[PDB]
Design a binder for this molecule. Structure first.
Ligand SMILES: Cc1n[nH]c2c1[C@](c1cc(CO)cc(-c3ccccc3)c1)(C(C)C)C(C#N)=C(N)O2
Ligand SMILES: Cc1n[nH]c2c1[C@](c1cc(CO)cc(-c3ccccc3)c1)(C(C)C)C(C#N)=C(N)O2
Ligand SMILES: Cc1ncc(COP(=O)(O)O)c(CN[C@@H](CO)C(=O)O)c1O
Ligand SMILES: Cc1ncc(COP(=O)(O)O)c(CN[C@@H](CO)C(=O)O)c1O
Lengths: 409, 411
């Protein structure tokens, strides 16, 4: 009824609802939040200005909003064991912006993971604030094993003498050894920052080593494997850093927090404390490993580094005679959503790429088990091997319909 | 009902905040009540979509319908303010201003911006904010006697300091801002002009405040103050080269994925503001504000900064009552009237004590308050602050608040 005033907007949202229902979402950074998370984001908390921190706000009327933010803060400490948490960052990018401000000065040397090797844009890309503001030096992966070589990282750190080392990634499927990163940073007198955005849910479930005890500052988003609303978060065990973090977020780089989104964070953090979340996180990894097995045994879908320890995988598609952009377009035509993605030592443009990234958090939330993840990987192989054969692409599109109807939203 | 069972802590707190919004007078000048549609958009499944890039130029697929939503927000923003280009992705007004500075100046450049005590925003050059840390801000303020901007003093400052950029706009300034004169001063010294119209955006949309968009190289705003939309930011320009720098600065410059469920809410609110009834709402905001100023002017103890309002807000120096702004804020909150303490021009107290409070009418006007009701609010505020903790008087104020909130219920 409130929809009648604006039929064009609500029609577009209606089609987006159907698109999420009918497509297989394999974008590693996406998920489906609960009804309760969306209700919190749709709450009247959007009306409240609440700059400052609980008990020390710059506006009247915040005494009940402060409960909501305290719940999000305290549940983050329960989930990750951090002594201090800041839940106001609007995004992972803002969380990383504030983390750097608390740790280094403009122009300082920072060692972070190269984008082609799997790092995030905010880990030193020259088109991002990170590369523009600080002197970033990149580390990568080994050309043959495509995993991090910690002796090479050590050599790099000693050569460049960074003030800060950043660990974490957007497209790295293997266990990150935070203990070794901390050893290297200590060796050269650098601080350590970990961006666990992609693996935060796995960390919360005990299925990836926890960076919080090792890093000066841990950042994360709330909307990937944590299955919360879109937003950021910063964690630390040092009260001196917590004060700099809090000042950097506000008044440093943000103004009013999004308290309806922070309520969604509180909701999602409590869901993550439930034992069911550990089973969900176990299923994520089992599903990713099952898919990786199919791609390892298929002709032309080369899995970067040959295995996965977490929720995602990179597929090199060069032997199929296509680039990542064409692989993404083929799979879209059969209702399978991935993203083109640079692979280690990428030689093509970042907008063409030699690969695609696939992750299992979203389909696992829909209910997919290992046999269903196997079927998904077989449909992906079939569609990419079907050199424009309309008969086989329609068979794949049929198999996708079978899966989406088997696991509705 | 069932999802609320899993988490009583969270949902009981939200229920208490619903009751507080219903039962209080919300006089925070930057707050409003958004429509059911706006909140439904924010509560939609668009929160699940990663959509980095811009409509038609995303970095990956599945964005066909998100592109429709974001283009609706862009197109209605263009129509609302008459701008040739809009960027609707900024997470907030602070992010909008961050990206606007990146499109206009280089780190270390000299910028003229309104002093915080004089009414400017933190992002207009405060040294504890990224603005004051990243650029060389020279502040202009208001005159000590009239408490309004002296444009000859701005011109003198501009000529003396040769700024690369002049910033106009305010958080706690109740008078009309003469954008034409800012453009004249910027042209004279060869500076660019940036206008942050967050507070007055809805008044501008309604033609009730001079429009900065024709005069400013870049105009920024929030969507949640007088525009009555979701919490977020927006950037406008008529220059195609600037529009490209703006888009690059927002992403991949300072943000990652946009909040498309919030952007859906921006589209909803922009169409609401395009309705003719939004003009009548905006007229009533100003008439209510002027009605309150007349009451505060007559009352001894509540000194209105500059003695008048041209827009939605007023700044009240409370020192003659023997209290500071923090004490006034907590007196009012104890009788269910919600304001914020606020520095006044040439503020002599700590920024966390302050000499004043700030009051605005957009929220109560959205509830349906007319000039008669606005007069009654101002009388209640005067009575609470003069009561010197006489509980007879304070309880009468609480009754008056309850009378008004029941006369004008939410939804
Ligand atoms: C958007 C983004 N932010 N951080 C990222 C991305 C990714 C991405 C994807 C693409 C696809 O056209 C381009 C870029 C890009 C990088 C530099 C310049 C221009 C474009 C980046 C992915 C994970 C979304 C990417 C890859 N590849 C990984 N490594 O990190
Ligand atoms: C939060 C904010 N952002 N931009 C603003 C604010 C205001 C505000 C209020 C307060 C209340 O104790 C303190 C500060 C403050 C300024 C500098 C350093 C430390 C604190 C600022 C108002 C509009 C919310 C304010 C005032 N006064 C001005 N004019 O603009
Ligand atoms: C490690 C890490 N840190 C930060 C961010 C940025 O989060 P934001 O999109 O909330 O700004 C991302 C987003 N990652 C997205 C691309 O932006 C992805 O598809 O993987 C990230 O992976
Ligand atoms: C002119 C202007 N520009 C920018 C911003 C920042 O918007 P944000 O809170 O969405 O970051 C504000 C916020 N204004 C708030 C204080 O932060 C207020 O209560 O007035 C503003 O007034």
């Amino acid at each position: 009824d409130y929809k009648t005033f604006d039929p064009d907007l609500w029609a577009a949202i209606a089609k987006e609802e159907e698109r999420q229902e009918h497509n297989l979402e394999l974008i590693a950074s996406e998920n489906f939040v609960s009804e309760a998370v969306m209700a919190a984001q749709g709450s009247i908390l959007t009306n409240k200005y609440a700059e400052g921190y609980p008990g020390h706000r710059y506006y009247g009327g915040c005494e009940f909003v402060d409960i909501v933010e305290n719940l999000a803060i305290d549940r983050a400490k329960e989930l990750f064991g951090a002594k201090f948490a800041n839940v106001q960052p609007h995004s992972g990018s803002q969380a990383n912006t504030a983390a750097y401000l608390a740790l280094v000065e403009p122009g300082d040397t920072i060692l972070g993971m190269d984008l082609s090797a799997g790092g995030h844009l905010t880990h030193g890309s020259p088109v991002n604030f990170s590369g523009k503001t600080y002197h970033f030096v990149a580390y990568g992966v080994d050309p043959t094993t495509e995993v991090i070589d910690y002796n090479v990282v050590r050599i790099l750190a000693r050569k460049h003498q960074p003030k800060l080392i950043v660990a974490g990634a957007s497209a790295y499927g293997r266990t990150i050894d935070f203990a070794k990163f901390r050893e290297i940073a200590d060796e050269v007198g650098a601080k350590l920052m970990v961006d666990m955005a992609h693996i935060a849910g796995l960390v919360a479930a005990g299925l990836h080593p926890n960076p919080v005890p090792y890093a000066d500052i841990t950042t994360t988003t709330t909307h990937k494997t944590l299955r919360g609303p879109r937003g950021g978060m910063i964690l630390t065990n040092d009260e001196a850093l917590a004060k700099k973090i809090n000042s950097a977020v506000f008044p440093g780089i943000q103004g009013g927090p999004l308290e309806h989104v922070i309520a969604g964070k509180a909701v999602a953090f409590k869901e993550a404390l439930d034992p069911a979340f550990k089973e969900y996180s176990e299923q994520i990894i089992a599903n990713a490993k099952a898919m990786v097995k199919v791609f390892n045994q298929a002709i032309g879908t080369r899995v970067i580094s040959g295995a996965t320890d977490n929720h995602l995988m990179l597929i090199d598609v060069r032997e199929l005679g296509i680039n990542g952009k064409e692989a993404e377009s083929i799979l879209d035509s059969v209702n399978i959503t991935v993203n083109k993605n640079s692979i280690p030592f990428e030689t093509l443009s970042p907008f063409k790429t030699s690969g695609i990234r696939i992750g299992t958090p979203a389909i696992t939330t829909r209910g997919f088990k290992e046999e269903d993840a196997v079927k998904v990987a077989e449909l992906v192989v079939k569609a990419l091997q079907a050199k424009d054969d309309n008969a086989q692409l329609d068979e794949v599109k049929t198999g996708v319909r079978e899966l989406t109807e088997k696991f509705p939203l």
